């Protein structure tokens, strides 16, 4: 019964069977109660502030060939671009002028910048008195150390899938063991570390999703980014099914219940599969939003998946838009950098 599962969730009995049953039950009443629980846990632990992370997708060059990704190296039907360091720093300054208190630098795994151009950019942005988050993929420990010395605060590296067999198949350049090692290194070096996963990957099962939740709980990540898999037409997975919004929303809600003091975004992928999907997610456990701050003409070239929102409006629309969103949700903008505020418990 759904009631018994909520009760166990409420009492923090986070066993594999409780999580599987939560993900397996499709009853509307159960789902709504689950979302309300997550919403309330969010409010009690991390409050009503929604933290804004302005993302600059500074290069769509990638050396890897992940099967799901539109930036995979085998995709010749994409115009590749690189922003200059000056462009990236000045675009970050514009976001800070617009009120962003974290700048996210995201790219394909593009060797050109690595490690020293990144270090130089990070130092320049840190002079602006904001947090800097990097999401550059897998690199040597030395690179991650140089970027931490340069001033980077956080690093996003979704674990993608905690099933090693499926991980290797979908990411043939690498492995779950390497992904995990990178995440452990980043934690050791003192980054706030973000993990997370896609929901609805071809071949991924409900038990796989459970394992993603247990993985997250085990490592106590500061941030958890979750969204659906969205097939991209220029990839091997073009004809596979998109991930289900509701199932993905349940993964966000359970992540909040399991990691009550974590930072959890309402991802752009949630708002791509369903109109208004970010706003729903912010009411089901999420507390972070990541407006796209990539300038034209590059913005439209950063297509990890199609339909990726926020492309036809002026490239300065997204920060204002998310501030309006936060108000109409009855929430507040973050006042500080929105680092994790751990609540130590039993």
Ligand X SMILES: CC1(C)S[C@](C)(C(=O)O)N[C@@H]1C(=O)O
Ligand Y SMILES: Nc1ncnc2c1ncn2[C@@H]1O[C@H](CSCC[C@H](N)C(=O)O)[C@@H](O)[C@H]1O
Ligand Z SMILES: C[C@H](CCC(=O)NCCC[N+](C)(C)CCCS(=O)(=O)[O-])[C@H]1CC[C@H]2[C@@H]3[C@H](O)C[C@@H]4C[C@H](O)CC[C@]4(C)[C@H]3C[C@H](O)[C@]12C
Report which DSSP code applies to 316.
Answer: T
Which residues from 326-345 bind ligand Z, rule CB under 6 A?
327, 333
Q: Which does 338 bind (CB under 5 to 8 A by kind): Cl ion, ligand SE, ligand Y, none?
A: none
Q: Establish if 224 lies at the interface with ligand Y (CB under 6 A).
A: no
The answer, yes or no, to whether the previous bond of 8 is cis (omega within 30 of 0) is no
String of contacts with Cl ion for each residue 99-138, x by CB under 5 A: ---x------------------------------x-----
Query: Please, what is the minimum distance in Å from the beta carbon of residue 270 to ligand Y?
Result: 10
Which residues from 131-160 bind ligand SE, rule CB under 6 A?
138, 141
Q: Which does 295 bind (CB under 5 to 8 A by kind): ligand X, Cl ion, ligand Z, none?
A: none
Cα distances (angstroms) measured from residue 94 to each of 70, 100, 124: 28, 9, 13
Query: Please, what is the minimum distance in Å from the beta carbon of residue 208 to ligand X?
Result: 18
Phi-psi group of 122: left, alpha or beta (phi > 0 → left; psi -120 to 50 → alpha; rest → beta): alpha
Q: How many CB atoms lie within 10 A of CB 168?
A: 16
Q: Establish if 232 lies at the interface with ligand Y (CB under 6 A).
A: yes
Those residues with Cβ within 8 angstroms of residue 317's Cβ, 6 or more apart along the chain or in another chain: 310
Query: Please, what is the minimum distance in Å from the beta carbon of residue 77 to ligand SE?
Result: 31
The answer, yes or no, to whether the previous bond of 294 is cis (omega within 30 of 0) is no
- Please state, in angstroms and rounded to a whole number, the distance separating the CA atoms of residues 96 and 89: 11
Strands 102-107 vs 131-135: parallel, antiparallel or unpaired: parallel
Strand partners, 135: 106
Q: Establish if 215 lies at the interface with ligand Y (CB under 6 A).
A: no
Q: Which of 267, 287, 294, 310 binds ligand X (CB under 6 A)?
A: 267
Place of tokens 């452990």: 184
Q: Establish if 54 lies at the interface with ligand Y (CB under 6 A).
A: no
Q: Establish if 225 lies at the interface with ligand X (CB under 6 A).
A: yes
Residues that bind ligand SE (CB under 6 A): 138, 141, 181-182, 185
Residues that bind Cl ion (CB under 5 A): 53, 102, 133, 154
């Amino acid at each position: 019964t759904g009631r018994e599962i909520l009760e166990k969730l409420e009492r923090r009995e986070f066993t594999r069977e409780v999580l599987k049953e939560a993900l397996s039950i499709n009853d509307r009443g159960f789902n709504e109660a689950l979302f309300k629980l997550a919403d309330e846990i969010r409010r009690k632990y991390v409050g009503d502030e929604v933290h804004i992370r302005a993302i600059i997708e500074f290069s769509n060059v990638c050396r890897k060939n992940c099967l799901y990704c539109g930036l995979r190296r085998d995709n010749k039907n994409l115009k590749r671009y690189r922003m200059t360091p000056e462009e990236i720093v000045e675009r970050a300054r514009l976001a800070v002028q617009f009120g962003a208190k974290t700048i996210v630098l995201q790219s394909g795994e593009d060797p050109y910048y690595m490690p020293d151009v990144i270090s130089d950019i990070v130092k320049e942005i840190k002079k602006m008195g904001v947090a800097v988050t990097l999401s550059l993929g897998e690199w040597p420990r030395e690179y991650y150390e140089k970027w931490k010395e340069a001033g980077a605060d956080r690093y996003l590296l979704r674990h993608e899938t905690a099933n090693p067999v499926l991980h290797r198949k979908l990411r043939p350049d690498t492995s779950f063991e390497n992904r995990l090692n990178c995440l452990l290194t980043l934690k050791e070096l003192g980054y706030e570390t973000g993990a997370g996963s896609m929901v609805g990957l071809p071949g991924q099962t409900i038990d796989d999703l459970v394992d993603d939740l247990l993985f997250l709980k085990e490592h106590d990540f500061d941030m958890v980014g979750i969204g659906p898999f969205i097939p991209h037409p220029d990839t091997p997975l073009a004809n596979e099914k998109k991930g289900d919004f509701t199932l993905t929303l349940k993964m966000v809600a359970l992540t909040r219940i399991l990691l009550p003091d974590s930072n959890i975004p309402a991802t752009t992928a949630m708002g791509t599969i369903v109109p208004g999907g970010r706003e729903i997610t912010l009411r089901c456990g999420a507390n972070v939003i990541m407006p796209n701050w990539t300038p034209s003409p590059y913005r439209q070239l950063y297509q990890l998946y199609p339909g990726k929102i926020s492309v036809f409006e002026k490239d300065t629309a997204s920060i204002p838009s998310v501030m309006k969103m936060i108000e109409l949700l009855g929430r507040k903008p973050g006042r500080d950098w929105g680092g994790r505020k751990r609540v130590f418990e039993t």
